[PDB]
RNA sequence: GAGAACAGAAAUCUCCAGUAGAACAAAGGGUAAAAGCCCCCUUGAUUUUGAUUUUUGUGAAUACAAACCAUGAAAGU
RNA sequence: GGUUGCGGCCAUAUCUACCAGAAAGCACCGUUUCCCGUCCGAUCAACUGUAGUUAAGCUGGUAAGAGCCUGACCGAGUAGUGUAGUGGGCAUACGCGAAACUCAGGUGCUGCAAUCU
């Protein structure tokens, strides 16, 4: 039975991480503003490595996060370019689920080579109705084990809605 | 004499058994975990390795 | 510890200095630990007391300033009160005695009784 | 496990639960001290869902004390059943417990606001109810700031936005709005004032209706208390386990 | 720890655990809606009057009142 | 007796697992014009308690559970220790006197105000 234990999609998360900091990244930037609507956020480099050619505080990728139709929406026409089939992974113990494309272009948007092509990855996170005790200020707790997001919950909402196979 | 010695000597080693039983049970799992921790550590570090990290500086 | 707060200490009050980790700010006097002086001013953030500290063989007097978190009541002179006024009733019932104290007296003769109690002989 | 809970250190209770900041609060009740008794007051307010809470504590190792406590379930009394959690009905507990307390002191003091845990935002309820209490005339120190109508670009303040904001005017105006655009949300969050069919001049009037019987009788006329202590007690006694 | 195209042990993203194992000028005390990181505003690291401890010489720290000030809605600092 | 708000003492309260919770409230929850802040009304800010839910949180019981606390004719008058002797080659005499461990028991108590079938 579940009248308020359902299982909604909170938000998901599309991000691209560039291999170079510059013009490229302000063109993923457009590219994900134009997709979402909003302004995206760009992400620094946390430590130097030197193999992948970067230093501190590079600005070496961005992303931006969705909540609400806009989301389910996006998600829908993103997974039409991974033709609505997962793997057993790519679902998290926690109960989220992401994936990855190359040639964003496979969505609508359309080539345009002023700019260039980039892939990214979505993430998504799934939740139930109760979050806000773990989230607010006053009168935070925690959650129970049995409304607590899984794997298994959420790969049967998914061979649900959207009707995919888990491939493995 | 030896039928009373060695009943009362039996009570006693059947709580020293119990005693025994207990403690090693108890031991026995905590050092199954602390295994499993110390592997699990190692493995870790194994693949650390890998990453330069001078530990001093600040990266 | 809040309680630690709300202790008013007026001029005359007798407590013991006992300063705890868990607050950087006046950690005094290295060596005035577990030592008991009275207080002579209180102002904000502040108490004074007054130690008489012994240097050659006289006892000088050294008075100082403390935050209230370190101070303490002293529980000295309890059975000292309590002493002096059942001294008081003890006076008013004898107007109407060995109020002083006494160590420990020799207890008095008994008598042992055998009902239940049968001595239990027994050796080595 | 073993070692972790052993060497774990609790908080105290009340913060374990997310209910107080000693922090603040050791700031709030520690006197100056050099005078000794001189028990200091805080005016507490507190926002649940659908009712609001303001009291007036003096706290002591006993652990505290409550001379004056007012909640928003009382306004139906004074002539409003509706919005009890709003800016304007928080304004109105706050000046029926400063007229409260100033009728048992018997002036017409000085009192501390305590803002909880809720985020010092401009325009914020907290500070209705200190306008409120101001209204009522405890003194409590605060600055023009906060109010809202509070103009962000610079250092002033327009005192007929907040008095729209007082008599309710945002509510209003929302209402004509969502009124004149549709009637979905309208019917759905509007119903008893759909049934009630109350104006923007009425409802200011209304609250000018409270104000004054506020001011008429703020002495706590109590609630009537039906089905006494036993019974409560039994029948919950019903439903509570025991080892 | 689990999880996401190129992306791997380390590039960015999301969730869970996590009393501190991090940081605060290397095995130690103290600090977790902070004493830590980020953000807003400032530059009380300011003058005058006396008091205390370390210490007869000062300096250091300490509390204490009046002013000019900063800060926060405020308590207060 | 239940609950809410403010607290005191700060694990007998914490952790883990399961279950129950009529009513009351609390809470999730509904919406985003304004006050406000967000990459993102998720947090924070505001509005109506209307659409609806005890699923969650919260409250209470449960576990030869972990820990935490209390006690022990528990250890034990033991170890250790002050004093004396032309005592032996460590005991005796007058005295003081533990802790760990083990075992047993327990698992929050309360103040102020308000409110509820």
Same mark, same amino acid.
């Given at each position: 039975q579940n009248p308020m234990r359902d299982l909604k999609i909170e938000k998901l998360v599309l991000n691209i991480s560039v291999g170079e900091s510059g013009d490229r990244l302000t063109r993923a930037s457009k590219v994900l503003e134009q997709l979402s609507g909003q302004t995206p956020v760009q992400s620094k480099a946390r430590?130097?490595? %030197?193999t992948f050619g970067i230093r501190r505080n590079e600005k070496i990728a961005v992303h931006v996060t969705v909540r609400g139709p806009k989301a389910e929406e996006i998600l829908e026409r993103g997974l039409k370019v991974k033709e609505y089939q997962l793997r057993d %992974?790519?679902?998290?113990?926690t109960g989220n689920f992401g994936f990855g494309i190359d040639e964003?272009?496979?969505?609508?948007?359309?080539?345009?080579?002023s700019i260039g092509i980039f892939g990214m990855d979505f993430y998504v996170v799934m939740n139930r109705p109760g979050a806000r005790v773990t989230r607010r200020k006053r009168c935070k707790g925690t959650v129970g084990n049995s409304h607590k997001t899984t794997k298994e919950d959420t790969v049967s909402w998914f061979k649900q809605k959207y009707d995919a196979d888990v491939l493995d | 004499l030896k039928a009373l010695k060695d009943e009362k000597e039996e009570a006693r080693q059947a709580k020293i058994t119990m005693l025994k039983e207990r403690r090693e049970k108890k031991e026995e799992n905590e050092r199954y975990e602390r295994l499993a921790a110390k592997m699990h550590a190692k493995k870790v570090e194994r693949m650390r390795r890998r990453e330069k990290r001078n530990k001093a500086l600040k990266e | 510890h809040l309680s630690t707060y709300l202790k008013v200490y007026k001029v005359g009050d007798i407590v013991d200095i006992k300063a705890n980790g868990?607050? !950087?700010?006046?950690?005094?006097?290295?060596?005035? !630990?577990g030592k008991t002086g009275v207080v002579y001013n209180v102002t904000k953030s502040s108490v004074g007391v007054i130690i008489n500290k012994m240097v050659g063989n006289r006892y000088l007097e050294k008075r100082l300033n403390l935050r209230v978190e370190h101070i303490k009541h002293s529980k000295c002179r309890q059975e000292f009160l309590e002493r002096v006024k059942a001294n008081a009733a003890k006076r008013a019932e004898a107007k109407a005695v060995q109020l002083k104290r006494q160590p420990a007296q020799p207890r008095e003769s008994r008598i042992v009784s055998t009902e239940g109690n049968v001595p239990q002989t027994l050796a080595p | 496990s073993s070692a972790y809970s052993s060497r774990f250190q609790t908080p105290f209770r009340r913060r374990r639960e997310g209910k107080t900041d000693y922090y603040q609060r050791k700031r709030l009740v &520690?006197?100056?001290? /050099? @005078?000794?008794?001189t028990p200091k007051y805080r005016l507490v307010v507190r926002f649940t869902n659908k009712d609001i809470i303001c009291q007036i504590i003096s706290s002591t190792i006993t652990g505290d004390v409550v001379l004056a406590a007012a909640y928003s379930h009382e306004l139906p009394r004074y002539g409003? &059943?509706?919005?009890? &959690?709003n800016w304007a009905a928080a304004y109105a507990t706050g000046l029926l417990i400063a007229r409260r307390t100033l009728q048992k002191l018997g002036l017409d003091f000085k009192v501390f606001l305590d803002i909880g845990l809720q985020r010092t935002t401009t325009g914020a309820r907290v500070f209705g109810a200190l306008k409120g209490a101001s209204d009522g005339g405890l003194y409590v120190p605060h600055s023009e700031?906060?109010?809202?109508?509070?103009?962000?670009?610079?250092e002033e303040i327009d005192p007929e936005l907040l008095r729209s904001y007082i008599f309710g005017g945002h509510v209003s105006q929302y209402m004509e709005e969502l009124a004149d655009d549709d009637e979905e949300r309208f019917s759905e969050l509007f119903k008893g004032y759909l049934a009630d069919d109350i104006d923007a001049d009425s409802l200011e009037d209304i609250y000018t209706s409270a104000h004054e019987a506020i001011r008429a009788d703020? /002495?706590? @006329?109590? &609630?009537?208390?039906?089905?006494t202590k036993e019974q409560y007690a039994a029948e919950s006694k019903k439903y509570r386990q025991t080892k």
């Open positions: 430590y130097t490595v %030197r %992974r790519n679902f998290s113990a964003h272009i496979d969505l609508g948007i359309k080539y345009d080579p | - | 868990s607050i !950087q700010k006046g950690m005094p006097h290295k060596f005035y !630990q | &520690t006197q100056h001290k /050099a @005078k000794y008794n409003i &059943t509706h919005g009890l &959690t700031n906060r109010f809202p109508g509070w103009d962000f670009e610079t703020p /002495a706590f @006329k109590p &609630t009537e208390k039906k089905f």
